[PDB]
Structures are given as structure tokens and as C-alpha cells.
């Protein structure tokens, strides 16, 4: 199998979410991360031309970054406690797309198999992002 999964990173709070179906819309083209003083509050990912359903809460400022045509995420690092605190999306164009506060238990996610990239994300959410998982594929 070429697919692999990294996670789950964070806690057991909130409720499961998965962008598993969203990969049919296209590759990841953009990121939205809502961030407050201490946490990652909310997440949205654009697959092809279509934004995912917003997950997480409302108490924070929206940060939004668009990817270049053909730009793929090849690594994701971050930090968490009871809730997700930081996220860094490392792309194959050498960009490091960083969100949130540099504190907590660190993680460092890389794809298991040859020539795979970030295809979708899952995790847990409520008023914040409780946990995140990364799904790698061709
Ligand atoms: Cl799983
Ligand atoms: Cl949209």
C-alpha cells in the first residue's frame, strides 16, 4: 500500500472529523487556520477549488495561506497539550507554513512510503482543535 497515516496527535476531547471524501475535489490548494493566544482554534482545507466544512471554534483570528500550483505538503510538524497548539506545513517548494504558538509536546510527521504527499487531514474538534492526523498518499 502507498497510503500511510501520521497521528493521532492531541487529546480525546471533541468529536471526530475527517476530510477523507474531500480528496476527490482535488489536491490541497490552500489552508485556513484559526488561532488564538494559546491554541489552534479551527481548521479549513481547500481541496482543488472547494473548501472543506469548517471545523473547530470561533474564538480566534483566521490565518489563510494559498499554495502554488503543484505545491505539495511533504512534512507536518506541530505541538499540542490537551489541544493542538502549533502546526508547520513543509512543502516541496521549500516553504514552511507555520501557525500558532511554539509550546507543548512536539510531533514530526513524515510520509511512510515513496513519493507520497499530504492528501487529507482528520482529527478531533469542538470549540478548538483537540487532535490532528495526517493522511499521506500518491
Ligand atoms: Cl485510522
Ligand atoms: Cl469553496
Q: How far apart are CA 55 and CA 22, in angstroms?
A: 14
Query: How many domains, the chain?
Result: 1
Q: How far apart are CA 102 and CA 118, in angstroms?
A: 22
Experimental determination technique: X-ray
**Ligand 2 centroid to residue 13 C-alpha, Å:** 28
**Ligand 2 centroid to residue 48 C-alpha, Å:** 9
Q: Which of 3, 22, 13 is nearest to 122 (CA)?
A: 22
- For the CA of 44, the nearest ligand: 2
| Residues in the 5 Å CB sphere of ion ligand 2 | 50-51
**Ligand 1 centroid to residue 5 C-alpha, Å:** 7
| 75: number of Cβ within 10 Å | 18
Given in angstroms, what resolution was this structure solved at?
A: 2.1
Beta bridge partners of 131: 10, 124
Beta bridge partners of 5: 135
Q: Which of 5, 98, 122, 75 is nearest to 131 (CA)?
A: 122
- For the CA of 20, the nearest ligand: 1
Q: How far apart are CA 39 and CA 9, in angstroms?
A: 14
Cβ–Cβ under 8 Å, residues 22 and 28 = no
Residues spanned by the domain of 13: 1-138
Amino acid at each position: 500500500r502507498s497510503s500511510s497515516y501520521s497521528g493521532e496527535y492531541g487529546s480525546g476531547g471533541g468529536k471526530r472529523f475527517s476530510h477523507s471524501g474531500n480528496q476527490l475535489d482535488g489536491p490541497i490548494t490552500a489552508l485556513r487556520v484559526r488561532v488564538n493566544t494559546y491554541y489552534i482554534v479551527g481548521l479549513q482545507v481547500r481541496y482543488g477549488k472547494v473548501w472543506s466544512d469548517y471545523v473547530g471554534g470561533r474564538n480566534g483570528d483566521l490565518e489563510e495561506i494559498f499554495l502554488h500550483p503543484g505545491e505539495s505538503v511533504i512534512q507536518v510538524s506541530g505541538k499540542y497539550k490537551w489541544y493542538l497548539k502549533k502546526l508547520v506545513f513543509v512543502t516541496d517548494k521549500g516553504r514552511y507554513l507555520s501557525f500558532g504558538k511554539d509550546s507543548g509536546t512536539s510531533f514530526n510527521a513524515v510520509p511512510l512510503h515513496p513519493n507520497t504527499v499530504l492528501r487529507f487531514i482528520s482529527g478531533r474538534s469542538g470549540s478548538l482543535i483537540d487532535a490532528i492526523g495526517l493522511h499521506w498518499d500518491v
